[PDB]
Structures are given as structure tokens and as C-alpha cells.
């Protein structure tokens, strides 16, 4: 990872800042796998601005850039979060980027992810995804409504419940605009696919044919929804035109075809099929043509997620007898196992393709994990009151 210094932000008010901003920026950069922040334990100093920054102390220590900041109170009850990125190495002392934000204590972490998104894109030329969110299902220890569809920042904080249920909920999927979630609920007794508007809580009932309805995915252009129905005896792909409520069948047969994911063209799909025996990933244009297998490595591959630029995909894969999240380059065919935990499942990619969120078993339970797509960084998300599954990473917001 690219060395970088991130200094704890300056605090000027009721002793003890409400949020460690520097800590959030360091975690974000580290989380992407693109940077290696100096441990707070080795910082050669704790400067407060684009002046107290002495390059040789850093510019020397293999760090050609430091982040400094200041968190100051407002009479309005809000706060002012400001950061400055100093260019040691090359032109020591220079300020490469800086900014300041007025936010409520509720949005302190958001201001922290805004700084990191700015610093990340200025230094890497890749748009940051630190202000994104994730959706997931938590089975708590409450008895009436054990299942809860929740949403939080990609890093697990600031979570909120979208919906509580007495019956199982699964496979949330974000609309491309980030305003709605599609998911499967068994509340009515049988499987049902619904779309819920986050702001409103309004729920649109989409499909509840006989049998199982599940694994939804919105096309990137917003005009269609793909999913799998097993009303034919086995799962097959259907796509619904959201502007006309129209539904078309895409695959047919005795084989199971499910877990669709869209290529950037909103016309092609990668999906899981047990056609060849053990699950493998195939691709098909929904307008026509025969599906083509695309995973030839590994004994088994499934539940793919194609990146936003279509350069690669991540999936659940079996290599050397073990199942982990792996990624496959869609141009070269190169494959690389990214995770190393137990029973890795349902991987979802950040909108900039730099991180993947997935679940793994934990004792009798389940938790979420993040692994950078270059494979460098691995971390468990914050624990919550319950076992967690089916994470879905939101598009840019
Ligand atoms: Yb998936």
C-alpha cells in the first residue's frame, strides 16, 4: 500500500472530540487497499495545519504525504471539519488539496468520508466510495420480529432499520439511484419480491408467483429489474420492464439459473447455473442469444457481481478444495482468491471496484467482512446484536 501520514485532527471545544476524524480518514484509505497509513503509534509529530508540517520528519520516512485536520464547534450546535493534505516527498511543504465542511454531529463521520474521498481521488485518480452505504439482513435476538433489513455506511456505522419482519428477509438490491431496495420477504407466508422506497418506507409489490422469487438486481440504467423465479420447477431468469411492469423470461430449462448481475450495458447478465453439473457463472444478453459459460477455473463458481466498469467480477469460488471470494479479470481471464475466512458468501462490490463486502460464518452465526479487491486488506465489520447476511453495496450516492 502507498505510504501516507494521517494526523489526528485538531480539536477546539468541549474537551474530547465527538468523533476521531483523522482516525476515519486513515481507516478509509487503509480499507481501500490503496494506502498504508502510519500507525498512530509511529507518528513523528502531531501537527495541526499546512504550516506545522515538517516534511523531513515524514517526506523522509517514506511518506510523501500527510493529512492534517481541525474539528471546531459552531454556536448553531454544529461543527466545522477541515482537512489539509501536505505534499512532502516531491515538493515538501506544498498543499495538494484542502477543504472545510459545516455539519451536524450526526454528519461528522460523513464529513470524515468526504475528506477521504477527496484525498483518495486526488492521489489515485479513482473516485472514492467512502460515502456509500450497504444494505443487509440481521437476525436479532428479539422474538417477535427477528428479521431486520438494515442499512449503514459501508464501514458499518450509522445503521438504521428499513424493515422488521417476523419472517425471513433476504437478498436486498439497490436501485441505481440509491433511493430504493428490492428484497425478498416471506412475511406473507410464501416468497415475494418487493421494492421499498427508503425515504418513504413505501412498498411496491413486484412478484409473488407460485414457488420461490428471489435474487433481485436492478439494471445500471434504471429501466429494468432482473430476478429468478422457480415457478417452472427450477430457477430461471426473468427481467421486468419497470416503466411498463412487463415481465419477460430469459432462460428456460430443468437447470437452475439464478443470482443475476448486470454488465454496465444494462443488456447483458452474468448468472449462476448448474447446467454443467456443479454451479458455474454464465453470461447472456437478455434480448437474445444462448448463454455462454465464462468461468473455467475452479471446481465451482457462483453468485457473481460484475464491476461498474465491467473490467472484472468477484464471485464465490472453490479452489484447492476451499470456498472463498475470488475475482476474475473479464478481459484476460485471470483469477485471484481474495478472502481467507470460513464459508465465504454473497460478495458485493463497491461502486469504484476497490473493495468487496461479503459474509462468512462465525460460530453458530454469521458476520460481514471487507476485503480490498487487490487482496491487500482484510477486516471484519463492527459486530451488531445479531447474525448478519446478504450484504449489498450501494451505488454512488
Ligand atoms: Yb449476488
Amino acid at each position: 500500500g502507498r505510504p501516507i501520514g494521517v494526523v489526528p485532527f485538531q480539536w477546539a471545544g468541549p474537551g474530547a472530540a465527538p468523533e476521531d476524524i483523522g482516525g476515519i480518514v486513515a481507516a478509509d484509505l487503509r480499507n481501500s487497499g490503496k494506502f498504508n497509513p502510519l500507525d498512530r503509534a509511529r507518528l513523528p509529530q502531531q501537527p495541526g495545519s499546512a504550516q506545522e508540517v515538517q516534511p523531513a520528519a515524514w517526506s523522509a520516512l517514506g511518506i510523501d504525504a500527510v493529512v492534517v485536520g481541525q474539528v471546531t464547534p459552531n454556536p448553531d450546535g454544529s461543527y466545522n471539519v477541515a482537512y489539509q493534505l501536505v505534499d512532502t516527498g516531491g515538493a515538501p511543504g506544498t498543499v495538494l488539496a484542502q477543504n472545510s465542511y459545516k455539519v451536524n454531529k450526526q454528519w461528522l463521520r460523513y464529513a470524515g468520508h468526504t475528506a477521504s474521498d477527496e484525498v483518495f481521488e486526488k492521489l489515485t485518480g479513482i473516485k472514492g466510495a467512502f460515502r456509500t452505504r450497504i444494505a443487509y439482513v440481521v437476525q436479532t435476538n428479539g422474538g417477535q420480529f427477528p428479521y431486520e433489513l438494515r442499512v449503514s455506511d459501508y464501514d458499518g456505522y450509522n445503521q438504521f432499520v428499513v424493515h422488521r419482519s417476523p419472517q425471513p428477509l433476504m437478498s436486498p438490491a439497490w436501485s441505481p439511484d440509491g433511493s430504493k431496495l428490492a428484497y425478498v420477504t416471506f412475511e406473507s407466508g410464501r416468497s415475494a419480491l418487493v421494492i421499498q422506497t427508503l425515504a418513504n418506507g413505501a412498498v411496491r409489490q413486484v412478484a409473488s408467483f407460485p414457488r420461490h422469487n428471489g435474487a433481485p438486481a436492478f439494471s445500471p440504467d434504471g429501466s429494468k429489474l432482473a430476478f429468478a423465479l422457480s415457478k417452472t420447477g427450477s430457477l430461471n431468469l426473468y427481467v421486468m420492464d419497470l416503466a411498463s411492469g412487463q415481465i419477460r423470461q430469459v432462460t428456460d430449462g430443468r437447470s437452475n439459473n439464478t443470482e443475476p448481475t448486470w454488465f454496465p450495458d444494462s443488456q447483458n447478465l452474468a448468472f449462476t447455473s448448474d447446467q454443467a453439473g456443479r454451479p458455474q457463472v454464465y453470461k447472456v444478453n437478455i434480448n437474445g442469444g444462448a448463454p455462454q459459460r465464462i468461468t473455467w477455473e475452479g471446481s465451482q463458481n457462483q453468485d457473481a457481481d460484475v464491476s461498474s466498469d465491467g473490467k472484472f467480477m468477484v464471485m464465490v469460488s472453490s479452489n484447492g478444495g476451499q470456498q472463498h471470494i475470488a475475482k476474475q479479470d473479464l478481459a484476460t481471464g485471470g483469477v485471484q482468491v481474495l478472502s481467507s475466512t470460513f464459508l465465504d458468501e454473497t460478495p458485493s462490490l463497491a461502486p469504484n471496484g476497490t473493495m468487496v463486502i461479503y459474509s462468512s460464518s462465525q460460530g453458530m452465526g454469521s458476520v460481514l467482512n471487507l476485503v480490498s479487491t487487490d487482496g491487500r486488506f482484510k477486516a471484519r465489520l463492527p459486530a451488531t446484536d445479531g447474525q448478519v447476511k446478504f450484504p449489498a453495496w450501494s451505488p454512488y450516492l
Side-chain angles (χ1 to χ4, degrees), residues 219-275:
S219 58
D221 67 8
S223 72
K224 300 166 180 69
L225 181 71
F227 53 82
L229 304 166
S230 61
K231 68 186 163 158
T232 53
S234 75
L235 297 155
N236 269 283
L237 310 192
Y238 303 72
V239 178
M240 177 196 286
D241 179 82
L242 298 179
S244 67
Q246 191 85 55
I247 305 183
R248 277 257 133 217
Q249 170 164 35
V250 170
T251 63
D252 70 76
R254 299 190 69 82
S255 285
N256 294 290
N257 307 282
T258 187
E259 304 172 328
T261 180
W262 298 85
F263 281 73
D265 66 11
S266 304
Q267 156 168 180
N268 272 291
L269 299 175
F271 64 100
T272 303
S273 185
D274 61 13
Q275 165 181 179

Tab-separated table of all heavy atoms in Angstrom, residues 219-275:
chain	number	residue	atom	x	y	z
A	219	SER	N	-30.994	-3.074	-13.214
A	219	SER	CA	-30.045	-2.770	-14.287
A	219	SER	C	-29.407	-1.426	-13.960
A	219	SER	O	-30.033	-0.552	-13.361
A	219	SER	CB	-30.753	-2.686	-15.652
A	219	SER	OG	-31.782	-1.682	-15.647
A	220	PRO	N	-28.149	-1.219	-14.358
A	220	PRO	CA	-27.497	0.060	-14.066
A	220	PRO	C	-28.207	1.272	-14.679
A	220	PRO	O	-28.054	2.364	-14.172
A	220	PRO	CB	-26.109	-0.099	-14.671
A	220	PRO	CG	-25.904	-1.566	-14.722
A	220	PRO	CD	-27.242	-2.135	-15.066
A	221	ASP	N	-28.974	1.095	-15.757
A	221	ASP	CA	-29.624	2.260	-16.361
A	221	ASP	C	-30.955	2.621	-15.736
A	221	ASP	O	-31.598	3.612	-16.137
A	221	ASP	CB	-29.778	2.097	-17.874
A	221	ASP	CG	-30.748	1.010	-18.259
A	221	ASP	OD1	-31.457	0.420	-17.402
A	221	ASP	OD2	-30.798	0.748	-19.469
A	222	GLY	N	-31.360	1.817	-14.752
A	222	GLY	CA	-32.591	2.069	-14.022
A	222	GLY	C	-33.893	1.582	-14.636
A	222	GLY	O	-34.930	1.527	-13.962
A	223	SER	N	-33.850	1.189	-15.896
A	223	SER	CA	-35.073	0.753	-16.573
A	223	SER	C	-35.568	-0.685	-16.348
A	223	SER	O	-36.708	-0.995	-16.697
A	223	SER	CB	-34.906	0.987	-18.067
A	223	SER	OG	-33.979	0.049	-18.602
A	224	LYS	N	-34.770	-1.554	-15.735
A	224	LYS	CA	-35.203	-2.946	-15.599
A	224	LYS	C	-34.796	-3.629	-14.321
A	224	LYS	O	-33.825	-3.251	-13.671
A	224	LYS	CB	-34.620	-3.785	-16.747
A	224	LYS	CG	-35.014	-3.370	-18.171
A	224	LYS	CD	-34.095	-4.056	-19.196
A	224	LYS	CE	-34.438	-3.677	-20.624
A	224	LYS	NZ	-34.133	-2.244	-20.952
A	225	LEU	N	-35.525	-4.671	-13.966
A	225	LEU	CA	-35.163	-5.415	-12.787
A	225	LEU	C	-35.045	-6.857	-13.200
A	225	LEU	O	-35.922	-7.362	-13.905
A	225	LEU	CB	-36.237	-5.269	-11.704
A	225	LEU	CG	-35.966	-6.000	-10.382
A	225	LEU	CD1	-34.833	-5.314	-9.596
A	225	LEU	CD2	-37.260	-5.983	-9.561
A	226	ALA	N	-33.955	-7.514	-12.798
A	226	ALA	CA	-33.754	-8.930	-13.088
A	226	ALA	C	-33.891	-9.744	-11.809
A	226	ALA	O	-33.560	-9.274	-10.705
A	226	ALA	CB	-32.353	-9.191	-13.720
A	227	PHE	N	-34.373	-10.964	-11.951
A	227	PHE	CA	-34.553	-11.844	-10.802
A	227	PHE	C	-34.801	-13.274	-11.249
A	227	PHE	O	-34.899	-13.553	-12.446
A	227	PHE	CB	-35.733	-11.383	-9.910
A	227	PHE	CG	-37.036	-11.182	-10.649
A	227	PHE	CD1	-37.864	-12.265	-10.944
A	227	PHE	CD2	-37.435	-9.910	-11.036
A	227	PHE	CE1	-39.078	-12.086	-11.618
A	227	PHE	CE2	-38.651	-9.718	-11.710
A	227	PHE	CZ	-39.477	-10.828	-11.999
A	228	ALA	N	-34.910	-14.175	-10.278
A	228	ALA	CA	-35.141	-15.570	-10.572
A	228	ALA	C	-36.414	-16.120	-9.952
A	228	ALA	O	-36.666	-15.947	-8.754
A	228	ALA	CB	-33.985	-16.396	-10.126
A	229	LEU	N	-37.198	-16.805	-10.778
A	229	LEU	CA	-38.432	-17.438	-10.323
A	229	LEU	C	-38.304	-18.942	-10.579
A	229	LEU	O	-37.765	-19.349	-11.613
A	229	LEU	CB	-39.623	-16.910	-11.115
A	229	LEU	CG	-39.858	-15.407	-11.128
A	229	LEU	CD1	-40.852	-15.067	-12.237
A	229	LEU	CD2	-40.365	-14.970	-9.765
A	230	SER	N	-38.782	-19.760	-9.639
A	230	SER	CA	-38.737	-21.209	-9.801
A	230	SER	C	-40.138	-21.801	-10.065
A	230	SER	O	-40.361	-22.990	-9.840
A	230	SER	CB	-38.106	-21.892	-8.565
A	230	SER	OG	-38.834	-21.660	-7.366
A	231	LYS	N	-41.069	-20.978	-10.556
A	231	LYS	CA	-42.430	-21.441	-10.827
A	231	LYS	C	-42.454	-22.513	-11.894
A	231	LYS	O	-43.475	-23.183	-12.071
A	231	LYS	CB	-43.323	-20.290	-11.304
A	231	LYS	CG	-42.944	-19.767	-12.680
A	231	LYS	CD	-43.726	-18.523	-13.106
A	231	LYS	CE	-43.004	-17.835	-14.280
A	231	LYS	NZ	-43.878	-16.941	-15.119
A	232	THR	N	-41.352	-22.670	-12.625
A	232	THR	CA	-41.304	-23.684	-13.685
A	232	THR	C	-40.800	-25.027	-13.220
A	232	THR	O	-40.813	-25.996	-13.992
A	232	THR	CB	-40.421	-23.263	-14.881
A	232	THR	OG1	-39.117	-22.881	-14.416
A	232	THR	CG2	-41.065	-22.140	-15.647
A	233	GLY	N	-40.360	-25.091	-11.967
A	233	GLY	CA	-39.856	-26.339	-11.417
A	233	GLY	C	-38.413	-26.179	-10.997
A	233	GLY	O	-37.894	-26.927	-10.158
A	234	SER	N	-37.761	-25.195	-11.610
A	234	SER	CA	-36.375	-24.877	-11.323
A	234	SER	C	-36.182	-23.375	-11.578
A	234	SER	O	-36.881	-22.771	-12.387
A	234	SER	CB	-35.434	-25.708	-12.214
A	234	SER	OG	-35.405	-25.227	-13.545
A	235	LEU	N	-35.242	-22.768	-10.870
A	235	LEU	CA	-34.984	-21.338	-11.027
A	235	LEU	C	-34.588	-20.900	-12.451
A	235	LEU	O	-33.777	-21.535	-13.098
A	235	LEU	CB	-33.870	-20.944	-10.062
A	235	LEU	CG	-34.193	-21.120	-8.584
A	235	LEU	CD1	-32.927	-21.298	-7.786
A	235	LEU	CD2	-34.978	-19.901	-8.111
A	236	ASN	N	-35.163	-19.817	-12.944
A	236	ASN	CA	-34.760	-19.318	-14.249
A	236	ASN	C	-34.839	-17.828	-14.196
A	236	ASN	O	-35.529	-17.304	-13.357
A	236	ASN	CB	-35.639	-19.872	-15.367
A	236	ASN	CG	-35.076	-21.131	-15.935
A	236	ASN	OD1	-34.122	-21.088	-16.724
A	236	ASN	ND2	-35.608	-22.270	-15.503
A	237	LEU	N	-34.134	-17.157	-15.093
A	237	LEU	CA	-34.075	-15.703	-15.137
A	237	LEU	C	-35.220	-15.032	-15.886
A	237	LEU	O	-35.560	-15.420	-17.018
A	237	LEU	CB	-32.751	-15.278	-15.777
A	237	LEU	CG	-31.437	-15.899	-15.244
A	237	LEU	CD1	-30.257	-15.118	-15.820
A	237	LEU	CD2	-31.406	-15.864	-13.710
A	238	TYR	N	-35.781	-13.999	-15.252
A	238	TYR	CA	-36.833	-13.182	-15.807
A	238	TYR	C	-36.384	-11.734	-15.583
A	238	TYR	O	-35.673	-11.433	-14.615
A	238	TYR	CB	-38.167	-13.421	-15.088
A	238	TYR	CG	-38.655	-14.866	-15.093
A	238	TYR	CD1	-38.031	-15.842	-14.307
A	238	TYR	CD2	-39.744	-15.262	-15.893
A	238	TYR	CE1	-38.480	-17.197	-14.317
A	238	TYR	CE2	-40.201	-16.609	-15.905
A	238	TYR	CZ	-39.568	-17.563	-15.120
A	238	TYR	OH	-40.017	-18.885	-15.134
A	239	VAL	N	-36.774	-10.854	-16.495
A	239	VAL	CA	-36.454	-9.445	-16.406
A	239	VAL	C	-37.768	-8.669	-16.526
A	239	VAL	O	-38.568	-8.944	-17.423
A	239	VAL	CB	-35.532	-8.976	-17.555
A	239	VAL	CG1	-35.284	-7.485	-17.422
A	239	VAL	CG2	-34.181	-9.684	-17.491
A	240	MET	N	-37.989	-7.721	-15.614
A	240	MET	CA	-39.188	-6.884	-15.642
A	240	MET	C	-38.875	-5.442	-16.083
A	240	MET	O	-37.894	-4.833	-15.621
A	240	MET	CB	-39.852	-6.843	-14.273
A	240	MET	CG	-41.073	-5.915	-14.259
A	240	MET	SD	-41.634	-5.465	-12.621
A	240	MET	CE	-42.392	-7.003	-12.138
A	241	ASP	N	-39.688	-4.919	-17.005
A	241	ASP	CA	-39.558	-3.548	-17.515
A	241	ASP	C	-40.285	-2.728	-16.465
A	241	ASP	O	-41.505	-2.868	-16.296
A	241	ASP	CB	-40.271	-3.407	-18.874
A	241	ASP	CG	-40.192	-1.989	-19.448
A	241	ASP	OD1	-39.166	-1.632	-20.058
A	241	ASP	OD2	-41.163	-1.218	-19.278
A	242	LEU	N	-39.549	-1.886	-15.749
A	242	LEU	CA	-40.146	-1.089	-14.687
A	242	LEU	C	-41.061	0.012	-15.194
A	242	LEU	O	-41.971	0.432	-14.483
A	242	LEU	CB	-39.052	-0.498	-13.787
A	242	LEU	CG	-38.172	-1.523	-13.059
A	242	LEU	CD1	-37.133	-0.790	-12.236
A	242	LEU	CD2	-39.005	-2.417	-12.170
A	243	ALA	N	-40.833	0.483	-16.412
A	243	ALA	CA	-41.696	1.531	-16.951
A	243	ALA	C	-43.046	0.946	-17.396
A	243	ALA	O	-44.036	1.662	-17.453
A	243	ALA	CB	-41.008	2.235	-18.123
A	244	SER	N	-43.092	-0.353	-17.692
A	244	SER	CA	-44.347	-0.971	-18.133
A	244	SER	C	-44.798	-2.169	-17.299
A	244	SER	O	-45.777	-2.831	-17.659
A	244	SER	CB	-44.232	-1.395	-19.600
A	244	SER	OG	-43.287	-2.447	-19.762
A	245	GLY	N	-44.099	-2.451	-16.198
A	245	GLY	CA	-44.465	-3.588	-15.363
A	245	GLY	C	-44.369	-4.921	-16.103
A	245	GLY	O	-44.649	-5.985	-15.553
A	246	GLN	N	-43.958	-4.848	-17.363
A	246	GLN	CA	-43.806	-6.012	-18.235
A	246	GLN	C	-42.755	-7.022	-17.743
A	246	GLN	O	-41.689	-6.634	-17.260
A	246	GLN	CB	-43.387	-5.528	-19.616
A	246	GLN	CG	-43.432	-6.571	-20.687
A	246	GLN	CD	-44.808	-6.688	-21.279
A	246	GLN	OE1	-45.373	-5.700	-21.743
A	246	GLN	NE2	-45.363	-7.902	-21.273
A	247	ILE	N	-43.052	-8.314	-17.874
A	247	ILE	CA	-42.112	-9.358	-17.472
A	247	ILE	C	-41.803	-10.332	-18.618
A	247	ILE	O	-42.721	-10.864	-19.260
A	247	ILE	CB	-42.644	-10.180	-16.289
A	247	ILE	CG1	-42.991	-9.249	-15.138
A	247	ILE	CG2	-41.583	-11.208	-15.852
A	247	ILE	CD1	-43.479	-9.956	-13.858
A	248	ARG	N	-40.506	-10.563	-18.846
A	248	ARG	CA	-40.005	-11.465	-19.890
A	248	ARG	C	-39.120	-12.540	-19.275
A	248	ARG	O	-38.403	-12.293	-18.295
A	248	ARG	CB	-39.169	-10.693	-20.918
A	248	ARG	CG	-39.959	-9.991	-21.999
A	248	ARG	CD	-39.904	-10.764	-23.316
A	248	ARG	NE	-41.235	-10.904	-23.901
A	248	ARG	CZ	-41.648	-11.996	-24.537
A	248	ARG	NH1	-40.819	-13.037	-24.662
A	248	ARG	NH2	-42.887	-12.053	-25.026
A	249	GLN	N	-39.162	-13.731	-19.861
A	249	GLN	CA	-38.358	-14.837	-19.400
A	249	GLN	C	-37.105	-14.854	-20.262
A	249	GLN	O	-37.178	-14.667	-21.474
A	249	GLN	CB	-39.126	-16.153	-19.534
A	249	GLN	CG	-38.269	-17.380	-19.291
A	249	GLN	CD	-39.108	-18.620	-19.053
A	249	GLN	OE1	-40.178	-18.784	-19.651
A	249	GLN	NE2	-38.626	-19.509	-18.184
A	250	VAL	N	-35.962	-15.081	-19.620
A	250	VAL	CA	-34.670	-15.077	-20.283
A	250	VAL	C	-34.029	-16.461	-20.408
A	250	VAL	O	-33.370	-16.759	-21.396
A	250	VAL	CB	-33.729	-14.124	-19.520
A	250	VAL	CG1	-32.300	-14.264	-20.009
A	250	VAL	CG2	-34.249	-12.680	-19.655
A	251	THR	N	-34.181	-17.309	-19.400
A	251	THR	CA	-33.622	-18.657	-19.509
A	251	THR	C	-34.791	-19.602	-19.276
A	251	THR	O	-35.812	-19.212	-18.717
A	251	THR	CB	-32.535	-18.943	-18.443
A	251	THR	OG1	-33.128	-18.867	-17.148
A	251	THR	CG2	-31.380	-17.945	-18.536
A	252	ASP	N	-34.642	-20.848	-19.705
A	252	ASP	CA	-35.696	-21.847	-19.537
A	252	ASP	C	-34.996	-23.197	-19.520
A	252	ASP	O	-33.955	-23.346	-20.149
A	252	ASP	CB	-36.724	-21.746	-20.696
A	252	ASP	CG	-36.165	-22.208	-22.060
A	252	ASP	OD1	-36.049	-23.434	-22.253
A	252	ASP	OD2	-35.854	-21.358	-22.933
A	253	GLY	N	-35.529	-24.160	-18.774
A	253	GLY	CA	-34.902	-25.471	-18.719
A	253	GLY	C	-35.011	-26.125	-17.359
A	253	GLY	O	-35.563	-25.548	-16.435
A	254	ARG	N	-34.492	-27.335	-17.226
A	254	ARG	CA	-34.564	-28.020	-15.946
A	254	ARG	C	-33.394	-27.612	-15.045
A	254	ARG	O	-33.346	-27.996	-13.876
A	254	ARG	CB	-34.545	-29.543	-16.140
A	254	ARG	CG	-35.708	-30.109	-16.966
A	254	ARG	CD	-35.758	-31.662	-16.912
A	254	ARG	NE	-36.145	-32.170	-15.592
A	254	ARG	CZ	-37.398	-32.278	-15.150
A	254	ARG	NH1	-38.425	-31.925	-15.923
A	254	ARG	NH2	-37.622	-32.706	-13.906
A	255	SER	N	-32.454	-26.839	-15.585
A	255	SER	CA	-31.293	-26.419	-14.806
A	255	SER	C	-31.603	-25.180	-13.979
A	255	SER	O	-32.487	-24.398	-14.321
A	255	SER	CB	-30.107	-26.131	-15.730
A	255	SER	OG	-29.531	-27.339	-16.221
A	256	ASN	N	-30.875	-24.996	-12.891
A	256	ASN	CA	-31.103	-23.833	-12.049
A	256	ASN	C	-30.286	-22.662	-12.537
A	256	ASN	O	-29.072	-22.755	-12.675
A	256	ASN	CB	-30.757	-24.158	-10.602
A	256	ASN	CG	-31.696	-25.199	-10.003
A	256	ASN	OD1	-32.873	-24.919	-9.760
A	256	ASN	ND2	-31.184	-26.403	-9.779
A	257	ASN	N	-30.966	-21.559	-12.798
A	257	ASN	CA	-30.313	-20.350	-13.273
A	257	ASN	C	-30.864	-19.267	-12.356
A	257	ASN	O	-32.085	-19.002	-12.348
A	257	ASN	CB	-30.679	-20.108	-14.742
A	257	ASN	CG	-30.399	-21.317	-15.611
A	257	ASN	OD1	-29.247	-21.583	-15.980
A	257	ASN	ND2	-31.454	-22.084	-15.919
A	258	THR	N	-29.954	-18.656	-11.580
A	258	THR	CA	-30.295	-17.644	-10.573
A	258	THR	C	-29.139	-16.666	-10.326
A	258	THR	O	-28.133	-16.718	-11.004
A	258	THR	CB	-30.614	-18.328	-9.239
A	258	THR	OG1	-31.106	-17.360	-8.290
A	258	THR	CG2	-29.349	-18.976	-8.660
A	259	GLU	N	-29.314	-15.776	-9.354
A	259	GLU	CA	-28.306	-14.785	-8.957
A	259	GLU	C	-27.761	-13.939	-10.096
A	259	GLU	O	-26.534	-13.886	-10.318
A	259	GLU	CB	-27.158	-15.507	-8.231
A	259	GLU	CG	-27.679	-16.326	-7.031
A	259	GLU	CD	-26.653	-17.230	-6.348
A	259	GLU	OE1	-25.724	-17.761	-7.023
A	259	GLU	OE2	-26.806	-17.445	-5.117
A	260	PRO	N	-28.644	-13.232	-10.822
A	260	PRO	CA	-28.177	-12.402	-11.930
A	260	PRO	C	-27.442	-11.147	-11.472
A	260	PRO	O	-27.684	-10.660	-10.387
A	260	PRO	CB	-29.458	-12.068	-12.691
A	260	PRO	CG	-30.500	-12.013	-11.601
A	260	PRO	CD	-30.117	-13.191	-10.696
A	261	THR	N	-26.536	-10.648	-12.304
A	261	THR	CA	-25.821	-9.414	-12.013
A	261	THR	C	-25.665	-8.746	-13.378
A	261	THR	O	-25.446	-9.428	-14.374
A	261	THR	CB	-24.429	-9.699	-11.348
A	261	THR	OG1	-23.759	-8.461	-11.086
A	261	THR	CG2	-23.566	-10.556	-12.237
A	262	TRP	N	-25.789	-7.426	-13.437
A	262	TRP	CA	-25.698	-6.723	-14.716
A	262	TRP	C	-24.333	-6.224	-15.191
A	262	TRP	O	-23.530	-5.761	-14.384
A	262	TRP	CB	-26.604	-5.484	-14.690
A	262	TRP	CG	-28.062	-5.769	-14.513
A	262	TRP	CD1	-28.732	-5.959	-13.338
A	262	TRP	CD2	-29.021	-5.933	-15.561
A	262	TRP	NE1	-30.051	-6.237	-13.594
A	262	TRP	CE2	-30.258	-6.233	-14.949
A	262	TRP	CE3	-28.952	-5.867	-16.956
A	262	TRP	CZ2	-31.428	-6.465	-15.690
A	262	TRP	CZ3	-30.119	-6.105	-17.698
A	262	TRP	CH2	-31.332	-6.396	-17.063
A	263	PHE	N	-24.061	-6.340	-16.488
A	263	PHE	CA	-22.860	-5.725	-17.048
A	263	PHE	C	-23.272	-4.254	-17.184
A	263	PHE	O	-24.464	-3.954	-17.172
A	263	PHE	CB	-22.507	-6.294	-18.420
A	263	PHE	CG	-21.828	-7.609	-18.343
A	263	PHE	CD1	-22.541	-8.738	-17.991
A	263	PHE	CD2	-20.451	-7.705	-18.539
A	263	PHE	CE1	-21.894	-9.949	-17.826
A	263	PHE	CE2	-19.801	-8.912	-18.378
A	263	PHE	CZ	-20.534	-10.041	-18.019
A	264	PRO	N	-22.294	-3.323	-17.330
A	264	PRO	CA	-22.576	-1.894	-17.449
A	264	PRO	C	-23.546	-1.512	-18.566
A	264	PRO	O	-24.155	-0.455	-18.484
A	264	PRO	CB	-21.191	-1.264	-17.674
A	264	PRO	CG	-20.246	-2.271	-17.098
A	264	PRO	CD	-20.863	-3.577	-17.553
A	265	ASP	N	-23.696	-2.362	-19.582
A	265	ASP	CA	-24.604	-2.034	-20.705
A	265	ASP	C	-26.106	-2.180	-20.452
A	265	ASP	O	-26.893	-1.788	-21.296
A	265	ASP	CB	-24.244	-2.828	-21.981
A	265	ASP	CG	-24.462	-4.326	-21.847
A	265	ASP	OD1	-25.078	-4.800	-20.871
A	265	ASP	OD2	-24.007	-5.059	-22.758
A	266	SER	N	-26.485	-2.704	-19.286
A	266	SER	CA	-27.883	-2.909	-18.898
A	266	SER	C	-28.553	-3.804	-19.908
A	266	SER	O	-29.780	-3.790	-20.077
A	266	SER	CB	-28.656	-1.583	-18.791
A	266	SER	OG	-28.030	-0.675	-17.882
A	267	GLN	N	-27.740	-4.617	-20.565
A	267	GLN	CA	-28.264	-5.522	-21.557
A	267	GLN	C	-27.744	-6.933	-21.341
A	267	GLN	O	-28.432	-7.891	-21.629
A	267	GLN	CB	-27.918	-4.989	-22.957
A	267	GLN	CG	-27.889	-6.049	-24.034
A	267	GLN	CD	-27.842	-5.467	-25.439
A	267	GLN	OE1	-27.814	-6.206	-26.415
A	267	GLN	NE2	-27.833	-4.142	-25.542
A	268	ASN	N	-26.537	-7.067	-20.804
A	268	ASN	CA	-26.001	-8.397	-20.543
A	268	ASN	C	-26.004	-8.758	-19.059
A	268	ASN	O	-25.821	-7.889	-18.204
A	268	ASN	CB	-24.570	-8.510	-21.089
A	268	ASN	CG	-24.546	-8.939	-22.545
A	268	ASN	OD1	-24.883	-10.096	-22.886
A	268	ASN	ND2	-24.169	-8.025	-23.408
A	269	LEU	N	-26.203	-10.046	-18.778
A	269	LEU	CA	-26.224	-10.576	-17.411
A	269	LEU	C	-25.225	-11.719	-17.154
A	269	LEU	O	-25.023	-12.563	-18.003
A	269	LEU	CB	-27.596	-11.163	-17.078
A	269	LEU	CG	-28.895	-10.370	-17.073
A	269	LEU	CD1	-30.062	-11.319	-16.818
A	269	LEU	CD2	-28.820	-9.317	-16.003
A	270	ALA	N	-24.616	-11.754	-15.970
A	270	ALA	CA	-23.777	-12.912	-15.603
A	270	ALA	C	-24.689	-13.577	-14.544
A	270	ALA	O	-25.385	-12.880	-13.790
A	270	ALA	CB	-22.414	-12.482	-14.969
A	271	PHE	N	-24.710	-14.906	-14.507
A	271	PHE	CA	-25.555	-15.616	-13.568
A	271	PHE	C	-25.001	-16.981	-13.212
A	271	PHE	O	-24.081	-17.474	-13.848
A	271	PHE	CB	-26.978	-15.784	-14.134
A	271	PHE	CG	-27.063	-16.646	-15.383
A	271	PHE	CD1	-27.472	-17.983	-15.305
A	271	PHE	CD2	-26.776	-16.115	-16.630
A	271	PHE	CE1	-27.593	-18.779	-16.482
A	271	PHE	CE2	-26.898	-16.903	-17.809
A	271	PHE	CZ	-27.303	-18.221	-17.716
A	272	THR	N	-25.577	-17.583	-12.186
A	272	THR	CA	-25.168	-18.894	-11.750
A	272	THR	C	-26.084	-19.927	-12.405
A	272	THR	O	-27.293	-19.712	-12.510
A	272	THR	CB	-25.310	-19.019	-10.254
A	272	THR	OG1	-24.540	-17.981	-9.625
A	272	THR	CG2	-24.798	-20.402	-9.783
A	273	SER	N	-25.501	-21.028	-12.857
A	273	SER	CA	-26.258	-22.097	-13.496
A	273	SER	C	-25.612	-23.429	-13.144
A	273	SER	O	-24.382	-23.540	-13.139
A	273	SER	CB	-26.247	-21.912	-15.015
A	273	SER	OG	-27.072	-22.873	-15.648
A	274	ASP	N	-26.416	-24.444	-12.823
A	274	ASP	CA	-25.843	-25.753	-12.519
A	274	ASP	C	-25.934	-26.650	-13.754
A	274	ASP	O	-25.854	-27.872	-13.668
A	274	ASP	CB	-26.545	-26.416	-11.310
A	274	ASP	CG	-28.019	-26.664	-11.540
A	274	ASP	OD1	-28.479	-26.574	-12.684
A	274	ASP	OD2	-28.727	-26.950	-10.561
A	275	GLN	N	-26.069	-26.011	-14.909
A	275	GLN	CA	-26.176	-26.695	-16.187
A	275	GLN	C	-25.062	-27.709	-16.426
A	275	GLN	O	-25.334	-28.826	-16.864
A	275	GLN	CB	-26.184	-25.646	-17.301
A	275	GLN	CG	-25.945	-26.177	-18.681
A	275	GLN	CD	-25.936	-25.075	-19.701
A	275	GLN	OE1	-25.738	-25.314	-20.893
A	275	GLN	NE2	-26.153	-23.843	-19.241
